[PDB]
Write a protein that binds this ligand. Structure first.
Ligand SMILES: CNC(=O)c1ccc2c(c1)nc(-c1cc(C)c(O)c(C)c1)n2CC1CCN(C(C)=O)CC1
Length: 127
C-alpha cells in the first residue's frame, strides 16, 4: 500500500563509460520524449498512494519511468545501449499491462513509443 522505493539510478560498484550511443540516448532520445506534451505521466514513478491505485504495484513488479531512465543515463547506470532501450520498453509494456485499449494514458504511451521508435531507429554506430 506504500509505493515501492524508486528504481536504483546510481551504483558506484558498476563500471562507467561514455559512448556516442549513450550520449544520443540522453541528449536526443530521452530529451525529445521528455519535452513531449504527453511526457508528464511518464516523468516519475506512478504514485499509486496519491492516485489511490492500490493494485498498481500488485500488477506491475518491474516499474520504470523516464525520470529513472534520465538519472540512470546521467549517472552511468547503463554500460550497453540495450539496457536503456530495455527500460523504455518496460515503461511502455507496464502501461499496456495495467491499462485498457483506448484509455487516455494508453494513447499518450502510444504517441511517446512512436517517437521513441523514430529516434532509436537512428541510434549511432557502436564502437
Ligand atoms: C500532478 N499530477 C500528477 O502528478 C499525476 C496526475 C495523474 C496521473 C499521474 C500523475 N500519473 C498517472 C498515471 C501514469 C501511468 C503511466 C499509469 O499507468 C497510470 C495508471 C497513471 N496519472 C493518471 C493519468 C494521467 C494522464 N491522463 C490524462 C491526462 O487523461 C490519464 C490518467
Amino acid at each position: 500500500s506504500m509505493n515501492p522505493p524508486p528504481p536504483e539510478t546510481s551504483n558506484p560498484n558498476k563500471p562507467k563509460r561514455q559512448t556516442n550511443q549513450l550520449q544520443y540516448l540522453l541528449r536526443v532520445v530521452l530529451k525529445t520524449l521528455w519535452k513531449h506534451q504527453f511526457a508528464w505521466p511518464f516523468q516519475q514513478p506512478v504514485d499509486a498512494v496519491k492516485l489511490n491505485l492500490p493494485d498498481y504495484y500488485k500488477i506491475i513488479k518491474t516499474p520504470m519511468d523516464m525520470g529513472t531512465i534520465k538519472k540512470r543515463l546521467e549517472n552511468n547506470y547503463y554500460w550497453n545501449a540495450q539496457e536503456c532501450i530495455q527500460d523504455f520498453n518496460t515503461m511502455f509494456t507496464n502501461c499496456y499491462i495495467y491499462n485498457k485499449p483506448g484509455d487516455d494514458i494508453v494513447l499518450m504511451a502510444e504517441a511517446l513509443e512512436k517517437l521513441f521508435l523514430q529516434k532509436i531507429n537512428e541510434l549511432p554506430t557502436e564502437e
